[PDB]
Amino acid sequence: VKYTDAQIQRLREYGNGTYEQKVFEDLASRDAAFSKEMSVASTDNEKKIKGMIANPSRHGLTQLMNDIADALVAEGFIEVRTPIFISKDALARMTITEDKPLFKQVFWIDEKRALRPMLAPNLYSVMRDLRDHTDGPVKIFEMGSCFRKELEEFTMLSLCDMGPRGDATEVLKNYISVVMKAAGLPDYDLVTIDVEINGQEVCSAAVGPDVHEPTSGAGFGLERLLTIREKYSTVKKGGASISYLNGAKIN
Amino acid sequence: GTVKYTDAQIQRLREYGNGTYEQKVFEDLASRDAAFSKEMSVASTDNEKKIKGMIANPSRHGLTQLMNDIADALVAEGFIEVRTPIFISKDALARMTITEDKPLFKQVFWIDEKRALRPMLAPNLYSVMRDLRDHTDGPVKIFEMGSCFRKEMHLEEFTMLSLCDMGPRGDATEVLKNYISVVMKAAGLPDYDLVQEESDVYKETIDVEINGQEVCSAAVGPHYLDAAHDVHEPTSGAGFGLERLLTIREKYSTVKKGGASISYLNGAKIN
Ligand SMILES: Nc1ncnc2c1ncn2[C@@H]1O[C@H](COP(=O)(O)OP(=O)(O)OP(=O)(O)O)[C@@H](O)[C@H]1O
Ligand SMILES: Nc1ncnc2c1ncn2[C@@H]1O[C@H](COP(=O)(O)O)[C@@H](O)[C@H]1O
Ligand SMILES: [NH3+][C@@H](Cc1ccc2[nH]c3ccccc3c(=O)c2c1)C(=O)O
Ligand SMILES: [Mg+2]
Ligand SMILES: [Mg+2]
Ligand SMILES: [Mg+2]
């Protein structure tokens, strides 16, 4: 006997335990355990919010962004910031056309512009222009909000490099290692390449997608990383919200 | 003399250059045009040097660094850093008194019939601060840094830093002035003026100006706005334009160079 779907939802509202795994042998014992775990979840949540107010910290998502960013700069990556608005033409050069399914997920701002659903269009542009100014490899990254109709707003970390690279795949796997280790998630699986933790995809990366330079890139979902690391019971608690703050429900 | 660079020449000089071209005066058109030619070459050269320096010495972004400098200073003062959604509701805008008839309403980017890109951080911050009051009897002090959007030193996407305090100990105006000092000093801009300005949302604000350029609007209340958000105690708050601060501190010739861009990187044009 397990918690009902409704009970799971109620437990996850204020609690960050792993309630789906629990089994009982009696509706009566399920119900008694549920009552106790709901009370513990709620009191634990209240104590946690009372603690943040009393000892404020950098936001958990901001802290994670800083930890990863300082690691990438030490690896030689330039941090860039690009606009949230992108053009329809930019999406089309990404092959996101009325045909592709991602297109139907795009938030349009007007007839010619959209909220970016990924960071790559802008980063490709910046990377290519930076290469106009140097003979060497160019390595950049951005962290920022992306938007898709479904989290509808999520924070992507995208890194990319252009230029000569001995063993592109090995180099890309090392970039992934730098990020994951800096994020506090050193244990993960690789599946052009996907990063999974217990089957949950947290990164998609690839080597080398009219003359072009060698290029590779990796995109991480930072709320997903934070959720896994802090063992929050939903992906809606660690990022931007007016209901949650650093894992705790404020209302 | 009395001859200046033309408006078009000023725009051309500022594309790659961060000098103060609007101050130049010349005897005649020939001397103006000769100086323009020389200064355009200097600007392009200096710009290329800056780009090559950034490539040789990769760094955090200047806007990110400013955001961290100020945020660390506020957390040290006991402010909670929050992050709230970019999307907000039409009702939330109405609660700020941003309704159909108001000028700012015409500046709003709508996502659908009920939701918009936030033009300001106050709507979400009011909600969060009010809910945090449910959990403490003491001061509630929060801030957010994040993109806001307006149809328009103006950008259509800009980064606001908004702070607010519900129930501070002491006079709300002196407390607000001290918080402004913390931010401005942490931003590397200790010299500024505080100027009363009119506001259709707040009635009157205290603005932070540097050489006449607004970089922040701040206010206590007003009471009708607090009551509209179920807040029944003294509140204050301040909203800073981070690109404006960075532009002034780094002496960039336009506000488009230090923030998010596909043409500029930390003051230098890459294309
Ligand atoms: N379009 C914009 N681009 C860049 N910064 C902006 C923009 N609008 C506002 N800001 C910054 O946000 C701060 C707080 O926003 P506020 O609502 O007071 O702006 P505002 O009074 O409309 O400004 P302005 O008179 O300069 O248009 C402003 O002091 C300014 O520093
Ligand atoms: N709707 C979403 N919510 C949260 N994270 C997302 C979302 N879409 C994509 N991501 C993250 O972004 C990464 C790259 O996305 P994609 O470009 O779709 O492969 C994924 O591996 C996820 O971690
Ligand atoms: N005038 C700008 C500046 C502004 C001024 C007063 C404020 N007071 C507040 C009170 C509670 C919650 C948040 C705020 C806050 O954002 C805030 C911001 C704007 O709002 O765009
Ligand atoms: Mg304005
Ligand atoms: Mg103004
Ligand atoms: Mg103002």
Side-chain angles (χ1 to χ4, degrees), chain A residues 1-20 23-35 37-92 95 97 101 103 105-111 113-127 129-164 166 168-169 171-191 193-209 211 213-251:
Chain A
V1 181
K2 298 167 106 200
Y3 286 137
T4 66
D5 289 352
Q7 283 171 332
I8 294 298
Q9 286 308 306
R10 295 172 66 188
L11 286 162
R12 291 182 181 159
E13 192 174 24
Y14 290 87
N16 286 318
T18 72
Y19 311 105
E20 63 285 332
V23 180
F24 318 88
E25 43 198 72
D26 206 336
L27 258 58
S29 63
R30 180 200 65 185
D31 289 340
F34 173 77
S35 177
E37 299 214 70
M38 286 289 286
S39 291
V40 168
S42 180
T43 294
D44 279 355
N45 185 88
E46 189 64 51
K47 285 171 189 180
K48 211 177 149 41
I49 194 54
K50 287 194 177 160
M52 277 172 235
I53 292 166
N55 280 275
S57 294
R58 293 301 300 276
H59 189 279
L61 183 61
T62 307
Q63 183 67 52
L64 174 56
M65 281 195 283
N66 282 335
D67 291 348
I68 295 165
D70 287 335
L72 287 170
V73 167
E75 287 302 311
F77 281 81
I78 298 170
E79 184 185 4
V80 307
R81 299 187 74 86
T82 68
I84 278 171
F85 292 172
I86 60 168
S87 71
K88 188 159 165 162
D89 275 347
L91 282 164
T95 36
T97 47
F103 188 95
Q105 300 185 264
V106 166
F107 285 101
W108 298 97
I109 289 304
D110 57 38
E111 269 168 310
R113 304 193 294 168
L115 306 179
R116 65 194 177 183
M118 48 169 63
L119 298 174
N122 282 344
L123 286 185
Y124 262 121
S125 185
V126 172
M127 182 148 64
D129 286 340
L130 285 172
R131 280 278 313 119
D132 287 337
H133 298 277
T134 183
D135 287 307
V138 169
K139 307 191 276 184
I140 70 177
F141 71 98
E142 176 171 14
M143 296 166 180
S145 289
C146 294
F147 300 84
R148 301 184 193 179
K149 293 179 189 177
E150 297 294 331
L151 301 172
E152 292 206 319
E153 174 185 4
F154 59 98
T155 311
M156 202 180 289
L157 155 64
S158 284
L159 64 89
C160 56
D161 77 351
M162 179 182 282
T169 304
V171 169
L172 180 56
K173 291 179 150 133
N174 179 65
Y175 294 154
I176 289 168
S177 178
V178 170
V179 170
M180 293 303 283
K181 282 191 203 168
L185 289 169
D187 308 315
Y188 59 87
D189 305 301
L190 305 165
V191 174
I193 292 168
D194 284 346
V195 189
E196 292 184 349
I197 293 173
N198 310 139
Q200 176 68 243
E201 185 208 301
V202 297
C203 166
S204 74
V207 167
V211 179
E213 283 187 79
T215 57
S216 60
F220 302 75
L222 290 181
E223 289 87 1
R224 291 191 180 173
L225 292 175
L226 189 63
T227 297
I228 291 167
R229 191 189 73 189
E230 302 298 319
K231 301 182 180 318
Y232 298 149
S233 60
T234 83
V235 69
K236 292 183 176 19
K237 308 197 182 184
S241 183
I242 57 169
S243 292
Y244 290 92
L245 177 63
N246 302 316
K249 183 164 168 74
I250 69 177
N251 59 354

Side-chain angles (χ1 to χ4, degrees), chain B residues 96 98 104 119-127 129 142 148 150 158 160-166 176 199 201-202 205-207 214 216-222 225-226 229 231 235-240:
Chain B
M96 296 299 304
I98 300 163
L104 184 57
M120 49 186 333
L121 299 178
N124 286 336
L125 292 178
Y126 255 120
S127 188
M129 102 175 317
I142 67 181
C148 293
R150 296 180 189 182
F158 61 99
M160 189 167 319
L161 153 83
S162 290
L163 64 85
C164 46
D165 180 338
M166 217 179 166
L176 179 61
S199 172
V201 174
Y202 297 95
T205 57
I206 297 170
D207 281 14
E214 173 184 345
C216 171
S217 283
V220 178
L225 209 52
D226 291 335
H229 297 86
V231 171
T235 75
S236 69
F240 299 78

